[PDB]
Amino acid sequence: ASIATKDSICSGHGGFPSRPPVESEPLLKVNGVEVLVDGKQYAQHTDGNSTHGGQAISTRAWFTVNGKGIVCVGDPVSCGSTVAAGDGLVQVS
């Protein structure tokens, strides 16, 4: 799974459009883009009826930096969306 960074836009869900994440970890930088970790929030999006946020949920909890699980491409979000893209430099399996 490709590593998801701070600029990795989301895939969106339902009537709520896509959005980028706003938080990251400075301790690890890949190609100058800091890494995305658990507990970090996506921007808000709305379907015109209600506003949804989003929190990443890692599926590779074995590998942690700063003691928190690392999020990659394909992991669902607390708002129902999913990771859409990642950097091909690093792959985790």
Side-chain angles (χ1 to χ4, degrees), residues 23-92:
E23 337 184 336
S24 50
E25 193 49 58
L27 275 178
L28 256 284
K29 335 187 218 180
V30 187
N31 286 138
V33 198
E34 295 177 2
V35 303
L36 152 74
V37 74
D38 293 318
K40 300 310 178 176
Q41 179 223 340
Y42 293 1
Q44 301 285 320
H45 61 176
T46 179
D47 52 350
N49 161 42
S50 60
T51 306
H52 287 23
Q55 317 309 319
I57 306 171
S58 178
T59 73
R60 293 304 298 211
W62 84 268
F63 150 48
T64 68
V65 75
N66 177 57
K68 318 304 290 303
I70 312 311
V71 182
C72 302
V73 172
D75 320 302
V77 190
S78 69
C79 71
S81 307
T82 51
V83 187
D87 223 297
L89 265 280
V90 179
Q91 299 297 325
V92 186

